[PDB]
Amino acid sequence: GLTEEQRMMIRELMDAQMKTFDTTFSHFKNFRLPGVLSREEAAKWSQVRKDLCSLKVSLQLRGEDGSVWNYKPPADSGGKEIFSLLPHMADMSTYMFKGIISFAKVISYFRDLPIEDQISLLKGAAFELCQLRFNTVFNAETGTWECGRLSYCLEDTGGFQQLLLEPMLKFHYMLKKLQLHEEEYVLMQAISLFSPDRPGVLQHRVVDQLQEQFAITLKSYIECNRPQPAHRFLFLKIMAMLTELRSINAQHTQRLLRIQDIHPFATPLMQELFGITGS
């Protein structure tokens, strides 16, 4: 029951996703790994500890030869050990950000925007699109993001309910429970990417019209393909999660800048996307 334009729109988005989402992470290489073996500033450190303590994961690397490396992070002992996985995660996030920049650039609707708006939209949405792609490799039964030969497992710290307190973790579990199709994930990416109210966007009206068309396409897709009672209000649930994801983006951006202030680690691409000039 989709129009021809809506069908073409999903086709273009799915093409872009297929071309730019390395779901096996085969080309993620040469990344860093954790090493083997005042008053104003003290308040900053206390906040940064809170920014990180509920986001801890262990890391597993499965070798092509069948070997397995496993890393368990240190406990918070008041020192720099809370940062041990940040270079690695900066490298993974940077890899993902390159993929979502590539995703945007192959979409006609994005390519046709002024280059300054393209940059403003990617700066605005990079974390959101990255997390949406990460949700598709999230295993909610094991609390693990399965990234090809790499796995990131939430540290069983509190318990299951106490871990749902962290908004980005609650988001991953809640989104996984909706059991979305690839097409619904890629339309979520489009709706996030074409957000007319990101800082710096000049073509507000064009971007707003584009976003509405992606949202209408998603609404129509769901109506045409999901008649089951479980999917009543699914479109509205998804849109509400996209609004929540924008809020989480702002909050994790604040965490990033707080950490960067006392412990610089952002890669050059992260600096460009999240507003760090190099002073």
Ligand X SMILES: CCOP(=O)(OCC)C(=Cc1cc(C(C)(C)C)c(O)c(C(C)(C)C)c1)P(=O)(OCC)OCC
Residues belonging to the binding site for hyperforin are 93, 131-134, 252
Token digits of residue 94: 């940077």
Choice from 6, 17, 93, 120 touching ligand X (CB under 6 A):
93
The SS3 call for residue 115 is helix
Contact segment (CB under 6 A) with ligand X among 86-94, 112-120, 179-187, 200-208 equals 86-94
Amino acid residing at 57 = V
Closest contact distance (angstroms) between CB of 210 and ligand X is 25
Decide whether 89 or 178 has the Cβ nearer to ligand X.
89
Give the max Cα distance, the chain.
64
- 239 is an interface residue for ligand X by CB under 6 A: no
Choice from 21, 109, 110, 127 touching ligand X (CB under 6 A):
127
What's the DSSP call for residue 148? T
104 closest CA partner among 70, 78, 130? 130
243 closest CA partner among 119, 128, 161? 128
Contacts with ligand X in 241-260 (CB under 6 A)?
A: 252-253, 255-256, 259
Helix, strand, coil % over all residues of the chain, rounded to 5:
60, 10, 30
User: 117: exposed, middle or buried (C-beta count within 10 Å: 0-12, 13-18, 19+)?
Assistant: buried
Contact segment (CB under 6 A) with ligand X among 15-23, 85-93, 184-192, 226-234 equals 85-93
- 82 is an interface residue for ligand X by CB under 6 A: no
Choice from 31, 71, 134, 173 touching ligand X (CB under 6 A):
134
For residues 27 and 224, give the distance between their C-alpha atoms in angstroms, rounded to a whole number: 37
Contact segment (CB under 6 A) with ligand X among 111-119, 126-134, 187-195, 219-227 equals 126-134
User: 176: exposed, middle or buried (C-beta count within 10 Å: 0-12, 13-18, 19+)?
Assistant: middle
Token digits of residue 259: 């950490």
- 92 is an interface residue for ligand X by CB under 6 A: yes
Choice from 86, 153, 175, 201 touching ligand X (CB under 6 A):
86
- 62 is an interface residue for ligand X by CB under 6 A: no
Using CB under 6 A, list all residues that contact ligand X.
Answer: 55, 57, 86, 89-90, 92-93, 127, 130, 134, 145, 152, 168, 172, 252-253, 255-256, 259
